[PDB]
Symmetry: D3
Subunit: 116 residues, 6 copies
């Protein structure tokens, strides 16, 4: 996932960061202190950006032409996933975090099929 290539990939890298995005969104409901709200905003932005990186790397570095041929929806799915993560950056609603997780789960499903 480091572009050597090293051969090691797992959608879990993206997933755990998206899980933290949604967890932060949920915690925002639990404490109205402005400093806490701001820290949650700062950290959500950071973790969402890492998730985008992980998703992009799966698409550019792991997935190859036979995959794109077998899964003609994959390009669009990855774009949509990244856009969902942008939407979670901009929102305090955990529904936006969850949508991104749902998209990652669709990438994950394809990833492991290609590992069999």
């Amino acid at each position: 996932h480091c572009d050597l290539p090293c051969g090691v990939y797992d959608p879990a890298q993206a997933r755990i960061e998206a899980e933290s995005v949604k967890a932060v969104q949920e915690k925002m409901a639990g404490n109205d202190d402005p400093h806490f709200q701001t820290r949650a905003t700062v950290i959500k932005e950071q973790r969402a950006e890492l998730a985008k990186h992980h998703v992009s790397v799966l698409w550019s570095d792991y997935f190859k032409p036979p995959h794109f041929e077998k899964y003609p929806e994959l390009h669009q799915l990855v774009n949509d996933t990244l856009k969902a993560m942008s939407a979670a950056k901009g929102s305090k609603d955990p529904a936006t975090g969850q949508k991104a997780l749902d998209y990652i789960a669709q990438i994950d499903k394809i990833f492991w099929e290609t590992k069999k």
Copy 2:
């Protein structure tokens, strides 16, 4: 380009980094000092990674569904551009840097079309 959105994008960010990758490749042919070679390798890797970020951000953040409809080749073009940049990371041959620049120029052409209509 920063995902606010700020509304500010330009393929020149990707291009300048890809230009530095090819320049570094060229310079590796001009000085066989091992410490230089190593520094060149370190820096090429970093600038190529930055170019990959810039290209991915144009694809995810700038381009929108109407663009993917109008330019059905664009998803594959971006994927190929990123793969070209990984190949450049891997190589000292400036032809690899040039191939990445060639792909970015295809993206740049589409980008400025979308700025007009």
Copy 3:
């Protein structure tokens, strides 16, 4: 610009980040939602910091003694540019982003003469 040296320099790196800083200041005028305001503040701070790096690199790595002799005001101009970007970090007023852009344009003019 990467200190190899690679021989590749362009004030456009600094300018585009400074353009984003001003753009973000403008955005802040059109959406008073605090979460958006907070995100804008985070991102403005990041883009301005990158702009400062690009301006510093031009000054330390690209420009050379003959340039400083020919343009005796360039050192102070670069320092002033960096201080304008700090002022943009601290402000929501797009005029501060514009002042930083105006300083970068003066560095850009000199840069291209040195070519």
Copy 4:
């Protein structure tokens, strides 16, 4: 894992980075090209440093006084794990990457026991 706290942690973050470190070490045995050796070294250093970060965060942020009471070996285990990752940075031998994986696995066992409850 981000210090909010967000409450999300998994040793898998440290483990996947350590897996990439060992994989890089193995690949270094299969291609003696200097440019490749240099890239591998660069990237190993980066992924090992990320692994150290992940391990340090489990120790400082996830693990708490009752865990240090129940597992009195845990402080020294985490210190030993970080030193194993420094040793893997310094080595091309995949046994050093494996040793760090083996330490992480001890951390992971404790982690999941503390999650049972």
Copy 5:
């Protein structure tokens, strides 16, 4: 401190970042402008994270088994120091930045005993 090893370490790296965290907290008492409060929050988070890195590196990279033998309290001291810096991240109260500085001073004292 770069893991070469280079042999160069100084708790001053952690200390100056912790001092900037406390200074930020103090500044937050002097200007309730939201924009300023937010920038202060951003920056405090970043400098505290750097302080944590510095402390962790002293522990993992500088200190060695003879030191952990002579100072059996050192592992918990470092853990306590990093928890104190997490607490400073979460707070505007300069008492929290000061507690982190107090813990760093205990690490500094041990550090220089081990150097002589």
Copy 6:
């Protein structure tokens, strides 16, 4: 040092990174193993870059107009320091790291005079 402003500055941040650069250069002379040499080059590049950041921040953020009038050589001194750091990046010779330290030492002397010392 963080541009809040926080009011906290010390040229020691730059000094300790330049010390590590020089130390890395010394160690390079004592171990010609290719992997070691590559790691040393990677790290030297990183610490030198950090030193450049610290010096630049002193110049742009700590020092102010009255200081530039009192110390008319200060602008050129900071520029020369940054150039010396670039030269240390490019070199294995610890004399290059020492030259950067001597320039930092001149900035440090001015810094503490301005703190009123």
